[PDB]
Amino acid sequence: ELSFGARAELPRIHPVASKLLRLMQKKETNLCLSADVSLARELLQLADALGPSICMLKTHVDILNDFTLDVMKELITLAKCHEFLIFEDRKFADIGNTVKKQYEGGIFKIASWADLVNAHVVPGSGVVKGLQEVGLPLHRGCLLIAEMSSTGSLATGDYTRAAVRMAEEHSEFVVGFISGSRVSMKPEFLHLTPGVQLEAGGDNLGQQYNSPQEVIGKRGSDIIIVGRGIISAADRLEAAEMYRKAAWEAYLSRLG
Amino acid sequence: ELSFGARAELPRIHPVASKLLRLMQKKETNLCLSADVSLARELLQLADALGPSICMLKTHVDILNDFTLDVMKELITLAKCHEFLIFEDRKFADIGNTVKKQYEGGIFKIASWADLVNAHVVPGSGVVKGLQEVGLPLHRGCLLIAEMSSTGSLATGDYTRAAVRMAEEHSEFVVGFISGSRVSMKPEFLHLTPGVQLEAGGDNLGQQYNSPQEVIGKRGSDIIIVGRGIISAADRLEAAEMYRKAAWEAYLSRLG
Ligand SMILES: O=C(O)c1cc(=O)[nH]c(=O)n1[C@@H]1O[C@H](COP(=O)(O)O)[C@@H](O)[C@H]1O
Ligand SMILES: O=C(O)c1cc(=O)[nH]c(=O)n1[C@@H]1O[C@H](COP(=O)(O)O)[C@@H](O)[C@H]1O
């Protein structure tokens, strides 16, 4: 098993994955903050304070009450300053012709500011083809959703195998997965795992939590995605540091 | 098999489905226009001219370059005037906690103007639970995506059966399906079928077309969803009338 720094140099590595892996090793962080807030001011204050602790900031631009492209300009300034990627968790899931417009256009112009986006594989490979016609020219990457954290997820068995095949057949654009575990044996592919908290539990709407030690150490994922475990805490900086240290040590102990 | 007018009166019918079925029978239309345009002026001119020909106008609010909630105010005026429902084709596909915010909030406030939305079933029933916590109080309905029109779709076999079970267990909110065919034997549930053109063919990004006669007449669906077959035509009104007459006659001939 290679370090994040060595994976950043693999011959078939995508440039976005390389940039991410380099800054993960430099900063000793494999934490993605899920910045699940409705105010631009809160998003930017979290990005600035937690920037040093995270490899990535995951957005849901469509829950932000005061979205403007200028808010995203301020977020890019912080991402450059503190060295993290921006991941818009849009979960594209339409025919190729539709997702290309949803990615490039409308009010959000997601491709203009998002290093990474993600897509469901259920529509077939046209979803990836459509996205890549916008994303490849704009030097972007995509994650495919191979497994989900929620109760009753149908992303199991043959579905997960289809996501892995799709990623591997579109390696020019697809840089990894949303998954609960290592699903690809190819080290050029990132595994990002949501549904993470230090304590056992869930929410009232089908979310299920596992610990950083379980998902990084035992299940072999690369990055933890954490929302409420940080966002709902009083001291979001110390919460981020707890999750960072947990995920980083789990990674180190798997390397040996 | 019951007429649309008789289905509108079924004991377990959802109010949104009843309203739709009534206006389908009154207007002799089972055509949903996919208004896949980037300009508000074009969306509103299409809604006004084609309103009399359609039972429903399907939007992708996130490809509209000049979206404002006022554009949607003007669309609701036309929907009321010409008697059609508004369907936002958002394809919600996240955990329940996330989709409730995506449905109610952000810039789009989808639940404030959309009669219908749709959701993927891949995350499990939490996607429906989350949406219904916003949609039930706002007297809205939801369609579950049981089958898709695109090449390589994984929405087949056990997946489609899971979508039907989910719909039937959430009939307070779920009014039907996006599907290629009749998937539910319960007549209270609408079947809406995209991937429709009069001529054989496809697009370059995995879309596959079937005719109105095939999907309404042979496959037993209720409503055709048509985008480019109308939108790319020179005379979009005459194109809409051709699709309306095709879908309506296919429906009548299945009734006998
Ligand atoms: O793509 C995602 O990040 C995602 C996939 C998934 O399987 N589960 C999942 O929880 N998510 C997202 O990750 C975040 C989890 O947030 P918390 O449950 O608050 O930690 C939310 O923003 C979800 O939308
Ligand atoms: O939910 C949808 O309407 C949808 C589902 C599906 O399986 N296939 C599909 O084509 N669609 C949508 O229906 C429309 C089809 O447009 P045309 O191919 O131009 O007729 C697009 O807006 C798609 O996003």
Structure token pair of residue A184? 């690809």
Query: Angle at which helices B40-50 and B69-82 pack, to 10 degrees?
Result: 10
Among the atoms of ligand 1, which is closest to the Cα of residue B123? Answer: 7
Structure token pair of residue B13? 């019918």
Structure token pair of residue A235? 């001291």
How far, in Å, is the centroid of ligand 2 from the Cα of A156? 26
Structure token pair of residue A196? 């993470």
DSSP 8-state class, residue B40: H
Q: Are A35 and A43 in contact (CB under 8 A)?
A: yes
- Please list, in sequence order, all residues whose beta carbon lies within 8 angstroms of the beta carbon of residue A70, skipping any fewer than 6 positions away: none
Strand partners, B31: B224
Cα A216 → chain centroid:
14
Q: Report which secondary-structure segment, H or E, holds A116.
A: strand A116-120
**What residue segments make up the domains of chain A, in order of their start?**
1-255
How far, in Å, is the centroid of ligand 2 from the Cα of B73? 24
DSSP 8-state class, residue A100: H
Q: Are A145 and A154 in contact (CB under 8 A)?
A: no
From the number of C-beta atoms within 10 Å of its C-beta (0-12, 13-18, 19+), residue B231 rates as middle
How many H-runs (helices) and E-runs (strands) does chain B carry?
11, 8
- The answer to whether A91 is a known catalytic residue is yes
Q: Is A209 in a helix, a strand, or coil?
A: coil
DSSP 8-state class, residue A117: E
Alpha carbon of B246: minimum distance to chain A alpha carbons (Å): 24
Q: After which residues is chain A broken (C to N over 2.5 A)?
A: none
DSSP 8-state class, residue B175: E
Q: For residue B38, which of A109, A205, A120 has the smallest C-alpha distance?
A: A109
Alpha carbon of B123: minimum distance to chain A alpha carbons (Å): 4
Cα A39 → chain centroid:
21
From the candidates B19, B91, B109, B245, which is the catalytic residue?
B91
Structure token pair of residue B219? 């496959």
- β-pairing, B190-193 vs B116-120, is unpaired
Written as one letter, the residue type at B201 is: G
Nearest-10 Cα torsion for A167, A172, A177, A178: -120
The residue in chain A having the minimum alpha-carbon distance to the alpha carbon of residue B104 is A63
How far, in Å, is the centroid of ligand 1 from the Cα of B123? 11
Q: For residue B102, which of A198, A52, A218, A88 has the smallest C-alpha distance?
A: A88
Interface test with B, best of A60, A63, A207 (most B CBs within 10 A): A63
Written as one letter, the residue type at B9 is: E
- The answer to whether A89 is a known catalytic residue is yes
Strand partners, A176: A143, A190
Query: Angle at which helices B236-255 and B40-50 pack, to 10 degrees?
Result: 50
DSSP string, B192-241: EE-SB-SSS-B-TTS-B-B-HIIIIIIT--SEEEESHHHHTSSSHHHHHH
Q: For residue A100, which of A145, A136, A58 has the smallest C-alpha distance?
A: A136
Residues 198-217, chain B: which have Cβ within 8 Å of A?
203-207
Q: Cα(B167)–Cα(B176) distance, rounded to whole angstroms?
A: 7
Alpha carbon of B189: minimum distance to chain A alpha carbons (Å): 22
Q: Cα(A35)–Cα(A255) distance, rounded to whole angstroms?
A: 29
The residue in chain B having the minimum alpha-carbon distance to the alpha carbon of residue A91 is B93
Q: Cα(B20)–Cα(B10) distance, rounded to whole angstroms?
A: 13
Q: What kind of fold does domain A1-255 have according to CATH?
A: TIM Barrel (3.20.20)
Structure token pair of residue B186? 């319960």
Q: Cα(B87)–Cα(B77) distance, rounded to whole angstroms?
A: 15
Q: Is B128 in a helix, a strand, or coil?
A: helix
Q: Cα(A214)–Cα(A222) distance, rounded to whole angstroms?
A: 12
Q: Cα(B154)–Cα(B238) distance, rounded to whole angstroms?
A: 35
- Residue labelled with tokens 């899920």: A34
Structure token pair of residue B62? 């996130």
- The answer to whether B66 is a known catalytic residue is no
The residue in chain B having the minimum alpha-carbon distance to the alpha carbon of residue A155 is B122
Q: Ligand 2: which residues within 6 Å by Cβ?
A: A 94-95, 98; B 34, 36, 58, 60, 89, 118, 148-150, 178, 194-195, 207, 225-229
Structure token pair of residue A247? 């995920």
Written as one letter, the residue type at B199 is: E
Q: For residue B119, which of B73, B87, B152 has the smallest C-alpha distance?
A: B87
Structure token pair of residue B230? 């109308």
Q: Cα(B128)–Cα(A145) distance, rounded to whole angstroms?
A: 19
- Determine contact: B89 vs chain A, CB below 8 A: yes
Written as one letter, the residue type at B223 is: I
For ligand 1, atom 24, which residue shows the shortest CA distance? B98
DSSP 8-state class, residue B121: S
List chain A residues with CB under 8 Å of B126: 150-152, 205-207
Using the beta-carbon criterion (under 8 Å), do A63 and B102 form an inter-chain contact?
A: yes
Q: Are B212 and B197 in contact (CB under 8 A)?
A: no
- Please list, in sequence order, all residues whose beta carbon lies within 8 angstroms of the beta carbon of residue A251, skipping any fewer than 6 positions away: A4, A30, A216, A217, A222
Nearest-10 Cα torsion for B201, B204, B207, B211: -10
Q: How many CB atoms lie within 10 A of CB B172?
A: 13
Structure token pair of residue A33? 């903050």
Q: For residue B248, which of B24, B98, B72 has the smallest C-alpha distance?
A: B24
